């Protein structure tokens, strides 16, 4: 009875399959993939952030040169300068006039915001998707367990053992290269650690926040201070983290395909509704009811009464239940045409009880399996009026004949008329 | 379900149309145009006497 089932990946709607174990009473499923959080395999490549030109205070030798050295600070820009007369609180102070030397030095350093307000690159691989699958199973009525997708993992939370996937729809909405910012995730071809052109994204490139080493292509170019005054012209591109916040691109939780949401959390991409998942469960046999205890319902009748050709469970149908005992009776349409709100219907001795459903074909010819009794609930449905609210329960759109059957049979009849005109020429011929 | 209905102008009698909303139970109308008072646009031109 290990109920294999292909199953559409779509988050917020149950999938009430039916266990057709030969021998005991069937049991309904209610499989609602409440989440599809993904968590691909990734690597923190480098944080970036806006620089801070935290200038070390320049040297001023008063009469003669002070050669600078290339200190190992990140982007340690330093350039000696002469020809000053530095006004500092008493007019100038160095008594020479050209031998007055000024050595400006400036290096790049992570902002204090780099710790907290910082973009974040990644090389993103595929990893392994997850879900907090609720099943309000059978008569168990509850399990809300976190599972995987890899097609040999069980999760014995509750009483049932369930194996999921692997899904066929391997679209990781994340690209290979991704930038991340607070919550807005950008599938951006970040240049790399160690390279980013100044002004462009990643002018500062630190491996992490702690990492004292980094790459600071900021094009930091010191210029000489003006007219004999102490200061430090640092001519520099404002960061490619400054832009990338107001000339950026839009976020993947606002531009992704196939229906995903995002978090700066384990880097999941929630609720990506795409494709199917081959899911298979091993129910506890104790949860089964033996077949000789549920009422046999046959010699019944089913009919719609007001079928709504729609998403919300607007379709209804009375069923002339013809029971043997009285009790519960799990229900399901093995055809995917009709999706039913009720998993189970209570029964007195051969009464009648309407259920709710939703379909997509004007003439819903769907079987209904009322606890081992099939029936066609044939009929016709009506379109609604009021379509602006969240997502459907129908999810069964397919091909849905009033000018096709005798039309194309009539279309054929012209060319069918041919070879009974031709080869009757052969008879008139002989 | 915004029940459009052409409707005869006649005062003292209801017009019990029926709301055929697909999905829920229909509901009857009872539309009695109890009055058709008009009040055209006018102008006092002159009293005489």
């Amino acid at each position: 009875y290990e109920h294999t089932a292909v199953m559409p990946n779509k988050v917020g709607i149950p999938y009430k399959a039916l266990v057709e174990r030969p021998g005991y009473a069937p049991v309904h499923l209610q499989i609602q993939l409440v989440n599809t959080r993904i968590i691909p395999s990734t690597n923190l490549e480098y944080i970036t952030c806006k620089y801070k030109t935290k200038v070390p205070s320049p040297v001023v030798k008063c009469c003669g040169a002070t050669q600078c050295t290339s200190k190992p600070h990140p982007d340690y820009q330093c350039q000696v300068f002469t020809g000053v007369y530095p006004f500092m609180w008493g007019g100038a102070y160095c008594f020479c006039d050209t031998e007055n030397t000024q050595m400006s030095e400036a290096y790049v350093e992570r902002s204090e915001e780099c710790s907290i307000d910082h973009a974040k690159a990644y090389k993103v691989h595929t990893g392994t998707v997850q879900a907090m699958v609720n099943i309000t199973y059978g008569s168990v009525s509850w399990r809300s367990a976190d599972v995987y997708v890899n097609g040999e993992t069980p999760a014995k939370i509750g009483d049932a053992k369930l194996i999921i996937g692997p899904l066929s729809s391997a679209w990781s909405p994340f690209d290979n290269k991704v930038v991340v910012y607070g919550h807005e995730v950008y599938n951006y071809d970040f240049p790399e650690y160690g390279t980013g052109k100044a002004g462009s994204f990643g002018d500062l490139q630190s491996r992490t926040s702690t990492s004292n080493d980094l790459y600071a292509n900021t094009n930091l170019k010191l210029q000489r201070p003006q007219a004999g005054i102490v200061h430090t012209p640092f001519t520099q591109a404002p960061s490619g983290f400054e832009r990338w916040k107001r000339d950026k691109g839009a976020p993947l939780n606002d531009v992704a395909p196939f229906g995903c949401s995002i978090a700066l959390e384990p880097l999941r991409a929630e609720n990506c509704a795409v494709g199917s998942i081959p899911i298979s469960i091993d129910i506890p046999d104790a949860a089964f009811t033996r077949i000789s205890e549920t009422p046999t319902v046959s010699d019944l009748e089913c009919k719609i009464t007001e079928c709504t050709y729609a998403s919300d469970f607007g379709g209804i149908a009375t069923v002339a239940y013809k029971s043997s005992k009285a009790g519960n009776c799990p229900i399901h349409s093995p055809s995917g045409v009709a999706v039913i709100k009720e998993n189970d219907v209570t029964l007195a001795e051969s009464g009648s009880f309407t259920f709710h459903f939703s379909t997509a074909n004007i003439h819903p010819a769907f079987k209904l399996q009322v606890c081992t009794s099939a029936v066609t609930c044939k009929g016709d449905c009506k379109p609604p009026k009021d379509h602006i609210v969240d997502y459907p329960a129908q999810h069964t759109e397919s091909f849905t004949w009033s000018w096709l059957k005798v039309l194309v049979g009539g279309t054929s009849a012209f060319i069918v008329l041919g070879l009974i005109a031709t080869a009757v020429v052969a008879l008139v011929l002989f």
Side-chain angles (χ1 to χ4, degrees), chain A:
Chain A
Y1 63 89
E2 185 177 1
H3 187 274
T4 301
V6 64
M7 188 175 288
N9 190 0
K10 185 177 180 181
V11 63
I13 191 73
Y15 292 159
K16 294 181 183 295
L18 190 282
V19 176
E20 294 181 354
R21 182 264 181 85
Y24 292 170
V27 178
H28 62 86
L29 277 297
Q30 182 181 6
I31 296 170
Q32 184 177 1
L33 296 174
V34 66
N35 190 358
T36 306
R37 68 179 181 282
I38 292 176
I39 298 170
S41 293
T42 186
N43 297 114
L44 181 64
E45 298 295 328
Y46 63 92
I47 295 170
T48 186
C49 63
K50 64 179 73 175
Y51 63 89
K52 298 297 293 295
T53 303
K54 293 181 180 179
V55 176
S57 299
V59 177
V60 177
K61 184 176 185 294
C62 287
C63 295
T66 301
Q67 184 177 1
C68 186
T69 63
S70 296
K71 279 72 174 177
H73 295 88
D75 191 75
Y76 182 76
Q77 184 62 256
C78 175
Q79 185 174 359
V80 177
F81 294 101
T82 185
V84 299
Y85 184 72
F87 292 164
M88 186 67 203
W89 184 251
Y93 63 92
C94 295
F95 64 92
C96 290
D97 292 332
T98 187
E99 293 179 353
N100 297 328
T101 302
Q102 188 275 335
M103 183 177 74
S104 301
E105 65 186 1
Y107 64 90
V108 176
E109 183 173 358
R110 296 178 66 252
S111 182
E112 294 83 0
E113 289 183 352
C114 298
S115 295
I116 188 164
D117 181 72
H118 63 277
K120 188 182 285 185
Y122 291 104
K123 292 180 178 68
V124 177
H125 297 287
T126 186
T128 302
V129 303
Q130 294 179 355
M132 296 186 186
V133 177
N134 188 1
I135 300 167
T136 62
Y137 181 73
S139 296
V140 176
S141 69
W142 183 257
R143 62 91 55 80
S144 63
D146 190 0
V147 299
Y148 292 168
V149 66
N150 50 9
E152 66 278 19
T153 301
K156 184 177 184 293
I157 302 298
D159 291 329
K161 182 174 72 67
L162 72 167
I163 297 91
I164 295 93
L167 59 85
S168 66
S169 61
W171 292 270
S172 296
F174 292 170
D175 292 332
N176 189 0
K177 291 182 183 179
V178 177
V179 178
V180 175
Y181 182 75
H183 295 285
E184 293 179 353
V185 173
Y186 295 161
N187 60 3
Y188 182 76
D189 184 78
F190 63 93
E192 187 59 27
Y193 182 77
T195 186
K197 301 293 187 292
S200 67
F201 181 76
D203 62 348
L204 189 152
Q205 295 175 349
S206 295
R207 183 66 60 83
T208 185
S209 65
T210 301
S211 65
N212 290 318
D213 59 352
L214 60 85
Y215 181 76
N217 199 161
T218 61
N219 195 0
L220 183 64
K221 300 294 187 292
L222 295 172
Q223 293 181 357
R224 66 180 175 86
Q226 65 188 357
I229 299 169
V230 177
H231 61 93
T232 59
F234 63 95
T235 61
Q236 183 177 2
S239 177
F241 181 75
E242 191 276 331
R243 67 182 293 275
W244 184 257
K245 291 174 71 174
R246 81 291 183 279
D247 288 329
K248 66 185 182 63
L252 186 65
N253 64 9
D254 293 334
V255 298
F258 64 91
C260 300
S261 296
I262 303 298
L264 188 283
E265 291 189 353
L267 296 172
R268 69 268 188 98
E270 294 87 359
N271 302 331
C272 294
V274 64
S276 296
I277 302 170
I279 296 171
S280 180
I281 298 168
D282 189 0
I283 301 300
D285 193 1
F288 291 166
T289 302
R290 296 180 65 251
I291 190 69
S292 297
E293 290 78 0
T294 60
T296 61
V297 177
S298 178
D299 292 330
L300 61 85
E301 191 275 335
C302 178
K303 65 178 73 66
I304 57 88
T305 60
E306 181 66 27
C307 179
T308 308
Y309 182 71
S311 287
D312 189 0
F313 293 100
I316 60 168
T318 185
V319 176
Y321 293 103
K322 181 67 174 66
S323 66
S324 65
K325 292 181 181 179
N328 295 116
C329 177
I331 60 169
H332 180 73
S333 178
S335 295
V337 175
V339 177
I340 297 168
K341 185 183 286 185
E342 292 81 359
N343 57 7
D344 189 0
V345 64
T346 302
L347 295 174
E349 183 63 25
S350 296
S352 296
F353 293 98
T354 301
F355 63 93
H356 295 285
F357 64 91
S358 66
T359 62
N361 58 355
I362 297 167
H363 293 169
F366 64 93
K367 299 292 183 182
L368 182 63
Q369 184 176 1
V370 296
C371 62
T372 62
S373 295
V375 64
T376 301
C377 297
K378 180 66 173 66
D380 190 359
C381 306
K382 300 294 187 291
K385 294 179 180 180
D386 58 355
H387 306 89
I388 52 90
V389 177
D390 66 357
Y391 294 154
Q394 180 181 6
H395 64 278
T396 184
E397 184 174 1
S398 67
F399 294 98
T400 62
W401 292 353
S402 64
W403 293 97
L404 183 64
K405 186 183 286 185
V406 176
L407 188 283
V408 175
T411 304
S412 67
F414 293 101
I415 188 165
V416 175
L417 181 62
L419 76 162
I420 61 172
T422 300
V424 176
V425 298
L427 294 174
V428 175
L429 183 65
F430 294 101

